Design a protein around this nucleic acid. Structure first.
Lengths: 71, 49
DNA sequence: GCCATTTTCGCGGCTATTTTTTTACTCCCAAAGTTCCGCTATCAGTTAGTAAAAT
RNA sequence: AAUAG
């Protein structure tokens, strides 16, 4: 799951484009940032973050999980 | 595409289903193909190529 | 009209594996149906652009 | 046809 790219998350066009603009390439990268990075992402709206956290809740993960030895 | 049917159909009679709209049927077909092209639900069908 | 003799008819084991065959030969013409290239024209699909909507 | 059983 962690090694899977963000393109497996079924994100919207704007959400995927914003995450690519932030150069997030893997799920582990995204789940290591919380709102500290995502809410400050340019062009990333308020409803977008709600959608992302709903998706992660569907996948059983959350934001800002602390993982060692990544990558 | 004619799946589970005797004949294939063009956009006109597919629109004839509920809303006769070629531009709409074309958009929904494109959306369906885009969702089926997502790697989350296409690894099963990828093995048949 | 039955007793014998001659004439057809059908038969002669099961599994494998190596590998083609070959003569013989008019012509022309007019009439008819078919094909192949090129062009037209229509419809449907695809794609580019722009406005509508949402963040 | 030839060959093996």
């Amino acid at each position: 799951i962690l090694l899977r790219p963000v393109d497996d998350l079924e994100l919207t066009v704007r959400s995927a484009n914003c995450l690519k603009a932030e150069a997030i390439h893997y799920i582990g990268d995204l789940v290591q940032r919380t709102e500290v990075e995502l809410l400050k992402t340019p062009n990333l709206g308020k409803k977008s973050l709600t959608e992302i956290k709903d998706v992660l809740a569907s996948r059983g993960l959350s934001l800002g999980m602390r993982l060692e030895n990544w990558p | 595409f004619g799946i589970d049917m005797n004949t294939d159909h063009t956009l006109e009679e597919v629109g004839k289903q509920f809303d006769v709209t070629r531009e709409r049927i074309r958009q929904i077909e494109a959306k369906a193909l885009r969702k089926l092209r997502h790697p989350s639900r296409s690894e099963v069908l990828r093995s048949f190529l």
